[PDB]
Amino acid sequence: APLQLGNCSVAGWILGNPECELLISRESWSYIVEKPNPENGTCYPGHFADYEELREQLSSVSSFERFEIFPKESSWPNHTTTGVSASCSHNGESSFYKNLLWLTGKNGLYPNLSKSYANNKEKEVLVLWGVHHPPNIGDQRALYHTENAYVSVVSSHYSRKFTPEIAKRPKVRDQEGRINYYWTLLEPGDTIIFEANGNLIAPRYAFALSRGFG
């Protein structure tokens, strides 16, 4: 049986757009049914990297579990985690994706961060994150307290260093900045390491899954 996304896109559902909750949440499915112009997608505008490949990975799934990666706010005690946006409003109030967490300065500081997750399950884990591109210097400095921010994501078969640049884009859902979305599959037993000094939209929930097996 197929997974029915309702008014949500694959990106809206997997990121946890607050307007997306499946009517029927299941641990396995054969195909996904998505409507042609879904109303609820990347509510905070931005490019979703390798999106067609992600849709294919999620098209048929024999086991699926959404779980906390880096559990609780106590995983980020020296950053502010409560950032929300009018672009992802819910019930008349600014909100944010359920599966990512916007990290910004706290107490006048943005400390270097370095956080690891070890996949101690017997299934691969889909990890998603974002990299923020503010529209101007003032916004970049206000949130992250630097114009020289770097993000590093390293595992056994994946490494990428991001050097995010400012860019003023057309206003979409009130936003002239953008969040670019990224993902990778972490093999059982492997460890993923995030290091950053700004601009990281950190994983909050990740997904254990099996394909063709289960």
- For residue 190, the one-letter residue type is D
CA dihedral 141, 46, 56, 156 (to 10 degrees): -10
In whole angstroms, give the CA distance from residue 102 to residue 170.
Answer: 22
Q: Which two tokens stand for residue 151?
A: 């993000």
Burial code (b: 16+ CB inside 10 Å, e: under 16) for 78-98 equals: ebebeebbebbbeeeeebbbb
User: Whose CA is closest to 191, among 161, 157, 160?
Assistant: 157
Topology annotation, domain 1-214: Hemagglutinin (Ha1 Chain); Chain: A; domain 1 (3.90.209)
Exposed (0-12), middle (13-18) or buried (19+): which is 174, by Cβ within 10 Å? exposed
Residues contacting 52, CB < 8 A, separation 6+ = none
Expt. technique: X-ray
β-partners of residue 175 are 172
Question: Strand, coil or helix: what is 174?
Answer: coil
Domain ranges in the chain are 1-214
